[PDB]
Write a protein that holds these residues in place. Structure first.
Motif, PDB file in Angstrom:
ATOM      1  N   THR A   1      33.260  40.263  48.878  1.00 35.71           N
ATOM      2  CA  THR A   1      32.213  41.187  49.289  1.00 35.71           C
ATOM      3  C   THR A   1      31.486  41.835  48.118  1.00 35.71           C
ATOM      4  N   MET A   2      32.061  41.820  46.918  1.00 34.71           N
ATOM      5  CA  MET A   2      31.451  42.458  45.758  1.00 34.71           C
ATOM      6  C   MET A   2      31.362  41.460  44.616  1.00 34.71           C
TER       7      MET A   2
ATOM      8  N   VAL B   1      39.568  44.345  36.453  1.00 37.19           N
ATOM      9  CA  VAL B   1      39.427  44.733  37.848  1.00 37.19           C
ATOM     10  C   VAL B   1      38.759  43.582  38.576  1.00 37.19           C
ATOM     11  N   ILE B   2      39.417  43.074  39.617  1.00 33.28           N
ATOM     12  CA  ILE B   2      38.907  41.950  40.386  1.00 33.28           C
ATOM     13  C   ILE B   2      38.835  42.365  41.847  1.00 33.28           C
ATOM     14  N   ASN B   3      38.203  41.517  42.649  1.00 36.02           N
ATOM     15  CA  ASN B   3      38.115  41.715  44.089  1.00 36.02           C
ATOM     16  C   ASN B   3      38.738  40.511  44.777  1.00 36.02           C
ATOM     17  N   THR B   4      39.780  40.756  45.573  1.00 40.76           N
ATOM     18  CA  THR B   4      40.391  39.675  46.340  1.00 40.76           C
ATOM     19  C   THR B   4      39.400  39.093  47.338  1.00 40.76           C
ATOM     20  N   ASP B   5      38.605  39.949  47.969  1.00 44.46           N
ATOM     21  CA  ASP B   5      37.544  39.518  48.862  1.00 44.46           C
ATOM     22  C   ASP B   5      36.300  39.145  48.059  1.00 44.46           C
TER      23      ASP B   5
ATOM     24  N   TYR C   1      31.380  49.844  39.617  1.00 44.18           N
ATOM     25  CA  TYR C   1      32.459  50.706  40.086  1.00 44.18           C
ATOM     26  C   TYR C   1      33.382  51.100  38.942  1.00 44.18           C
TER      27      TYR C   1
ATOM     28  N   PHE D   1      41.989  55.485  45.986  1.00 41.14           N
ATOM     29  CA  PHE D   1      40.596  55.637  46.382  1.00 41.14           C
ATOM     30  C   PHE D   1      39.763  54.389  46.128  1.00 41.14           C
ATOM     31  N   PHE D   2      40.395  53.272  45.791  1.00 46.51           N
ATOM     32  CA  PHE D   2      39.657  52.033  45.607  1.00 46.51           C
ATOM     33  C   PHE D   2      39.071  51.566  46.936  1.00 46.51           C
ATOM     34  N   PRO D   3      37.837  51.069  46.943  1.00 52.50           N
ATOM     35  CA  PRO D   3      37.324  50.414  48.149  1.00 52.50           C
ATOM     36  C   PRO D   3      38.138  49.168  48.453  1.00 52.50           C
ATOM     37  N   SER D   4      38.209  48.829  49.739  1.00 48.21           N
ATOM     38  CA  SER D   4      39.039  47.713  50.171  1.00 48.21           C
ATOM     39  C   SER D   4      38.635  46.432  49.454  1.00 48.21           C
ATOM     40  N   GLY D   5      39.617  45.761  48.863  1.00 47.94           N
ATOM     41  CA  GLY D   5      39.364  44.523  48.155  1.00 47.94           C
ATOM     42  C   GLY D   5      39.694  44.572  46.676  1.00 47.94           C
ATOM     43  N   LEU D   6      39.389  45.688  46.021  1.00 51.95           N
ATOM     44  CA  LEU D   6      39.608  45.785  44.584  1.00 51.95           C
ATOM     45  C   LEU D   6      41.092  45.802  44.249  1.00 51.95           C
ATOM     46  N   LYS D   7      41.426  45.209  43.106  1.00 54.90           N
ATOM     47  CA  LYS D   7      42.771  45.273  42.561  1.00 54.90           C
ATOM     48  C   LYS D   7      42.676  45.226  41.044  1.00 54.90           C
TER      49      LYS D   7
ATOM     50  N   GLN E   1      36.084  61.863  45.175  1.00 53.77           N
ATOM     51  CA  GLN E   1      36.263  60.675  44.350  1.00 53.77           C
ATOM     52  C   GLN E   1      35.609  59.434  44.948  1.00 53.77           C
TER      53      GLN E   1
ATOM     54  N   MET F   1      44.086  56.567  40.297  1.00 47.07           N
ATOM     55  CA  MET F   1      42.809  56.076  40.807  1.00 47.07           C
ATOM     56  C   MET F   1      42.985  55.116  41.977  1.00 47.07           C
TER      57      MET F   1
END
Ligand SMILES: CCCCCCCCCCCCCCCCCCCC(=O)O[C@H](COC(=O)CCCCCCCCCCCCCC)COP(=O)(O)OCCN
Ligand SMILES: CCCCCCCCCCCCCCCCCCCC(=O)O[C@H](COC(=O)CCCCCCCCCCCCCC)COP(=O)(O)OCCN
Ligand SMILES: CCCCCCCCCCCCCCCCCCCC(=O)O[C@H](COC(=O)CCCCCCCCCCCCCC)COP(=O)(O)OCCN
Ligand SMILES: CCCCCCCCCCCCCCCCCCCC(=O)O[C@H](COC(=O)CCCCCCCCCCCCCC)COP(=O)(O)OCCN
Lengths: 1018, 144, 48, 96, 48, 48, 48
Positions: free
Chosen positions: B51-52, B45-49, B60, F27-33, A672, F24
């Motif tokens: 980096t993206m 879907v958001i990014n707290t950091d 994604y 398996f999220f990359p660090s940061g996503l919410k 995944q 899901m």
């Protein structure tokens, strides 16, 4: 209600004739099958991109189709496989009960929308969407003993003169072919292409623009001119229809009038479309025709009609061509159903015999002999109401329900006889009094049995249908039995019963009452004894193997051969030939024929696999336990371990070809995070190593895929191709046509459309160095060898790439160790999977998915069933404490079945569970009747709870013994059965007999005790 | 009206006109779906950091989230608020003219050098008598 | 409502005289100004 | 288009007709192919059969025959639909 | 009932020797006699 | 933006979507919410 | 037409059986719906 019929018997006879006629009409309009639909509906998209590897078909076909499989209703999941042979198999599994046609049409609609994105070769080959169902009704092999015709000729003849007419047979849902029909193979010779300054692309282009069909027009076509008098359509071009006609195809003329034809640089012949799979039958070449039964159709019929059609075709065959049947299941289901009918008839006869033995009045024994069959007939009608069929499960459920049918009849007739024998009343008054005595008891028994059996029909998953068949065929039987106890029996007891060994029975009954009184004197010991019995029953139940269904020797079995990686088609032979030689030399008296298929296998489709369908002789020619399938497969797999080249295992087909091995799981790792394929293999290897450290719970944890194999990679230098003037497309087309083939166009052989395949000759595409023999024509008429603008090497690649739910996946199979439940192993597996490298997920598929989704709904269903049973019992009696005296008889009936299962070595399968429920129901019925008589004596006569109970058990002893002797003797042949289909009936009979013995030998000593101890407690 | 039968009939009628559409329309993808007009829900879907960026998050969501949610039973349509990654070739007309190239040449070269080629097998069926090797052939692969 | 747009007339006879053919003209004017989906590629194992 | 009745009978009619075998409640089936190239393989079902389910059954059974059909029909497209056998009414339009 | 038909057969070798390809002869015959459908156009806002 | 199919139930579809999101999430990359800016079914649940 | 002609006699037989059985049930005799089953030919020859 029975009192309405005692004085009105003609109405009862009429409404019984209605039931009999309905049953007779339904027997003919009930389908027949070995098994119902158990697996959830599944649709299998199949595509073929010729010449590709796993990676190419995954990247260009599998992913494209998978990304467009959204918007389909009721989709449990999907899993796709991409083989190195260029095949793609995407199986979508839908919810149980989902309409198969709607699911298939939605899948095919999404596929049609996604088709323009597929490569042109896939579109030319075509992508087929088809529903997956039962394996095969019958495999109709065709062989040629004379050897004049090869396998291709036989397959072409089968496709021409057989598939068209066999498909027209009633009940044949679909047909399949075990070979490839004719297709013209133009065998390119690179030496002449280099000589005549030709290239494969020129051959393909010439064949394309030398065989097409063109629209022409009409003479005098509209709009016509004034004065026109004739109108005839004109014809311009027709497809070539002869080998030499393709031979004369003009490729080039050079400059001096060379006039080089197609046959100069290639060999034109008729061959197979696909040469991957070759099938044989006892060595000689052969073909086949897989046949599938329609959705609603007979199994005994629609299979004999096929045999009749083959017999009709037999005179119109080429010399030496004959028909054989390596695989058929119609005789097996026919024999099993005949045995079931014989068992029912024997049960009726023994009930008659025992009832004459106890009741010497002959005219009394005809009352059930008329009543019992009628209910059976009615049962069939109920099936016609619910759309069921004559399945093995339904007939065995009826066999189990015959015990309740017979005792329901015997109890009422014996009560009538006992009333007129004790009070000397006329038959009408005696029948009225007897029906008054058991007026509400029968209704309470019917409600209790319905509450017991209905919830078992609400299990979800594949196993839900198996339980549902028995539940329906037993609940309907009981509902009709209660009616025939309240309708036909009273009328017969009134109008067909005269007014007005025994000594030993009377002595035993008097001795029995004294024993019961002595037991009631001191009830303390018999309660701790009951507790000990319950504890032992629980201990035996917890420690017992579990299974799905008993595997049966259907007369055939399979042998699987798996050569190592890189093996050829001829290496599978002389190993698949040794299996045939062993089976036809060392097992001549047991094996009638063998159907060897090369390059098919079960895990993959490459050239290093094969399977033989070994069909044994008739069961009449296989005496003893050493000539059975189980005792033959072990000998075969022991004798096949001497082969140190392949890995050959002989096994037996499961009871249900869809799902089996209920103790095993179907774990599946998912990637995944886009890690790749090497990292996923590393994760799978780590999980396998970790699971190998727990041999106490997980056993035979193995992957369900093929490991990476060497492959020959050719990398083409683009700069060199540009410098030398050779286009990349030309090089790719030449390589693909030479080494993989190219379906060019179609032609007409004998009134049928066949394909035209262009491919290199066999000897020029065997070794890597043969690539040096291929030249590509540059722009300026210059030939460049592949050695100039390309290099090559060997690299490891996967031969079969599989995906789950649109993500790369690795399927891992395994089983729970003995003594460990499967759910106790799934938790360990998912605990081990939680320590894998990040990005690697997991999921359960197939049977594991059903087990995880359903959960522990069985205890909840049992609890609600027990609650409803208690409520019904508390309604039938008035006090809330009396029902406990009945609900405490279940362990008495369960302990005997558990003892029988342990002693005979049986397994806790579906048949054993249904037999356990049947014994529970019959014991509960006996307890209900005894306690009802005791309560009625206490109320209507005011007895002192001791003489009333003694009188009730004294007057109830005879029917209980009669029914026990009638039903134990009626299942003895099932227990002692050792013939064809004698594993299912043995399993369903041993448990029933064991439970029923101890549900009446000792329950008669416990129900009075329970009633007494409950009464002097509240 | 039954939704399944209506969709089946309208798609059967659409298949007749499908070959008449331009190749670009067909290769983009014509979609027939039975669904309501208003959005049942919106899942952001958001990014707290930091980096993206928006494109990273959208890619994604499209790659690892949109595919499985669109197959959930009862979901009739999924609209992505963005678009997944694609190899964007931003041509330069000045540089194209300098080397006497045209976008047609770029398209042709990309088609030629970014193809997945099937090249058959070594020792494929029908084999010659006495063959001990059978391995696949890897001609070309898509750029990654 | 109605909006302005850029109507560009390609002269067929002048294009033929100059030696160009009107297939590369349309292909250029389409690919440059409106994008042109060429084929697929494999990003992290997914077709894009 | 272009092919005569004999040519189109073996390449289209003889390819589609035999596939329609395992369809529920089918009484009979008649096909006709003329020199214009058009073919019409009608499938009369048993009375009371649900029409729109038989239609999807015929459609999904036909889709197993599309690969075997020649390419030239593919661009024309095969149309499977429920059909009657007589005109309900005719609406003529004239110019007075 | 059976109708007479006109059959035209082409010599591939002769056509190729004379410099005319089959891909030209077939479409010329089809357009001349059968009537070829080239593409669409707009008549009063309707595609025809 | 998720739109339910015609004839489907809103609440069970929302529950299935939330279950898929929960599956899901690990398996999220660090940061996503994941946020829910337009969830409408809670109003129906609260009203019932 | 052929199907109806084939299935008419079975229809007559089943109708006669149903009438006989219902009359026997209602009138509580077998002779009563046998003196009624003989007048049926009288009413059928009239239609013929
Ligand atoms: C096969 C099913 C046919 C059953 C028909 C039975 C009709 C019948 O016996 O009539 C009453 C049924 O009573 C009932 O209410 C029982 C239900 C059966 C109908 C008898 O009841 P009754 O009229 O004798 O007396 C009632 C109060 N006294
Ligand atoms: C009372 C005697 C007969 C009752 C008929 C019950 C049959 C049944 O289950 O009906 C189903 C509805 O209930 C359901 O959907 C089943 C759920 C009901 C809960 C369980 C209650 C048991 C009903 C009592 C029967 C026990 C016998 C009592 C003597 C419909 O299904 P269909 O197959 O009839 O129609 C074919 C279409 N699917
Ligand atoms: C169907 C309804 C069941 C009622 C049975 C008819 C009835 O009144 O029988 C009584 C006892 O039956 C009963 O009491 C037996 C019914 C037991 C469970 C009923 C619960 C249904 C909800 C009288 O019978 P009797 O003359 O012996 O007094
Ligand atoms: C089979 C075809 C059905 C024919 C109907 C016959 C009805 C029963 C005959 C006797 C009768 O009239 O029953 C009365 C009670 O009604 C009832 O309770 C009628 C009972 C019938 C109920 C169910 C009938 C359909 C059976 C379905 C077939 C399977 C008792 O009349 P009496 O002699 O007490 O008094 C007579 C003057 N007052």
């Amino acid at each position: 209600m029975p009192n309405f019929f005692i004085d009105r018997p003609i109405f009862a006879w009429v409404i019984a004739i209605i039931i009999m006629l309905a049953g007779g009409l339904a027997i003919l309009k009930l389908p027949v099958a070995q098994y119902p639909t158990i697996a959830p509906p599944a649709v299998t998209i199949s595509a073929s991109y010729p010449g590709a590897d796993a990676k190419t078909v995954q990247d260009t076909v599998t992913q494209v189709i998978e990304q467009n499989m959204n918007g389909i209703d009721n989709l449990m999941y999907m899993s796709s496989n991409s083989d190195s042979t260029g095949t793609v198999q995407i199986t979508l599994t839908f919810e149980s009960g989902t309409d198969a046609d709607i699911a298939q049409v939605q899948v095919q609609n999404k596929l049609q929308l996604a088709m323009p994105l597929l490569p042109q070769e896939v579109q030319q080959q075509g992508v087929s969407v088809e529903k997956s169902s039962s394996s095969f009704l019958m495999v109709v092999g065709v062989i040629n003993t004379d050897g004049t015709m090869t396998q291709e000729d036989i397959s072409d003849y089968v496709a021409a003169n057989m598939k068209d007419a066999i498909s027209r047979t009633s009940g044949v849902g679909d047909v399949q072919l075990f070979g490839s029909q004719y297709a013209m193979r133009i065998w390119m010779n690179p030496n002449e292409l280099n000589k005549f300054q030709l290239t494969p692309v020129d051959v393909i282009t010439a064949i394309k623009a030398q065989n097409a069909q063109v629209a022409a027009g009409q003479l005098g076509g509209t709009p016509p001119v004034k004065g026109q008098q004739l109108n005839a359509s004109i014809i311009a071009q027709t497809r070539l229809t002869s080998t030499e006609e393709f031979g004369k195809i003009l490729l080039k003329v050079n400059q001096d009038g060379s006039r080089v034809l197609l046959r100069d640089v290639a060999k034109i012949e008729l061959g197979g479309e696909n040469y991957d799979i070759i099938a044989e039958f006892n060595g000689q070449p052969a073909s086949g025709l897989g046949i599938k039964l329609a959705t609603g159709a007979n199994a005994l019929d629609t299979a004999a009609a096929i045999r009749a059609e083959l017999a009709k075709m037999e005179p119109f065959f080429p010399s030496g061509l004959k028909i054989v049947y390596p695989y058929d299941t119609t005789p097996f289901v026919k024999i099993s159903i005949h045995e079931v009918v014989k068992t029912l008839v024997e049960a009726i006869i023994l009930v008659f015999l025992v009832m004459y033995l106890f009741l010497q009045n002959f005219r009394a024994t005809l009352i059930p002999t008329i009543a019992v069959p009628v209910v059976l007939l009615g049962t069939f009608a109920v099936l016609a109401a619910f759309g069921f069929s004559i399945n093995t499960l339904t007939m065995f459920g009826m066999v189990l329900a015959i015990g309740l049918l017979v005792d329901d009849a015997i109890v009422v007739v014996e009560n009538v006889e006992r009333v007129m024998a004790e009070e000397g009343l006329p038959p009408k008054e005696a029948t009225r009094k007897s029906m008054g005595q058991i007026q509400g008891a029968l209704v309470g028994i019917a409600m209790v049995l319905s509450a017991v059996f209905v919830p078992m029909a609400f299990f979800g998953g594949s196993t839900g249908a198996i339980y549902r068949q028995f539940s329906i065929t037993i609940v309907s039987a009981m509902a009709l039995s209660v009616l025939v106890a309240l309708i036909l029996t009273p009328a017969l007891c009134a109008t067909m019963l005269k007014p007005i060994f025994n000594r030993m029975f009377e002595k035993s009954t008097h001795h029995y009452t004294d024993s019961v009184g002595g037991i009631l004197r001191s009830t303390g010991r018999y309660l701790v004894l009951y507790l000990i019995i319950v504890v032992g029953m629980a201990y035996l139940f917890v420690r017992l193997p579990s299974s799905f269904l008993p595997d049966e020797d259907q007369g055939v079995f399979m042998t699987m051969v798996q050569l190592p990686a890189g093996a050829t088609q001829e290496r599978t032979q002389k190993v698949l030939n040794e299996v045939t030689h062993y089976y036809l030399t060392k097992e001549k008296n047991n094996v009638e024929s063998v159907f060897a298929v090369n390059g098919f296998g079960f895990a993959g489709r490459g050239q290093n696999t094969g399977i033989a369908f070994v069909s044994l002789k008739d069961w009449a020619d296989r005496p003893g336990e050493e000539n059975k399938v189980e005792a033959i497969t072990m000998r075969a797999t022991r004798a096949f371990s001497q082969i140190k080249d392949a890995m050959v295992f002989a096994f037996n087909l499961p009871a249900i070809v869809e799902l089996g091995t209920a103790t095993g799981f179907d774990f599946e790792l998912i990637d995944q995070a886009g890690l790749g394929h090497e990292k996923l293999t590393q994760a799978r290897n780590q999980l396998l190593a970790e699971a190998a450290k727990h041999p106490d719970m997980l056993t035979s944890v193995r992957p369900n895929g093929l490991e990476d194999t060497p492959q020959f990679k050719i990398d083409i230098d683009q700069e060199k191709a540009q410098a030398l003037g050779v286009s990349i497309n030309d090089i790719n087309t030449t390589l693909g046509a030479a080494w993989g083939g190219s379906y060019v166009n179609d032609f007409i052989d004998r009134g049928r459309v066949k394909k035209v395949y262009v491919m290199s000759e066999a000897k020029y595409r065997m070794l890597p160095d043969d690539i040096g023999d291929w030249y590509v024509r540059a722009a300026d008429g210059q030939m460049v060898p592949f050695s100039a603008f390309s290099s090559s090497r060997w690299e490891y690649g996967s031969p079969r790439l599989e995906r789950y739910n649109g993500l790369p996946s690795m399927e891992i199979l395994g089983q729970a160790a003995p003594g460990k439940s499967t759910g106790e192993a799934m938790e360990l597996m998912e605990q081990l999977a939680s320590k894998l490298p990040t990005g690697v997920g997991y999921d359960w598929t197939g049977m594991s998915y059903q087990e995880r989704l359903s959960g522990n709904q069985a205890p909840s269903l049992y609890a609600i069933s027990l609650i409803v049973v208690f409520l019904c019992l508390a309604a039938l009696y008035e006090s809330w404490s009396i029902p406990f005296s009945v609900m405490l008889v279940v362990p008495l009936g369960v302990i005997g079945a558990l003892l029988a299962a342990t002693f005979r070595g049986l397994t806790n399968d579906v048949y054993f569970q249904v037999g356990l429920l049947t014994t529970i129901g019959l014991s509960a019925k006996n307890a209900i009747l005894i306690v009802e008589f005791a309560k009625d004596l206490m109320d209507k006569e005011g007895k002192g709870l001791i003489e009333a109970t003694l009188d009730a058990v004294r007057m109830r002893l005879r029917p209980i013994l009669m029914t026990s002797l009638a039903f134990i003797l009626g299942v003895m042949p099932l227990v002692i059965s050792t013939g064809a289909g004698s594993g299912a009936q043995n399993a369903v009979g041993t448990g029933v007999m064991g439970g029923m013995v101890t549900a009446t030998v000792l329950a008669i000593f416990f129900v009075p005790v329970f009633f007494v101890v409950v009464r002097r407690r509240f």
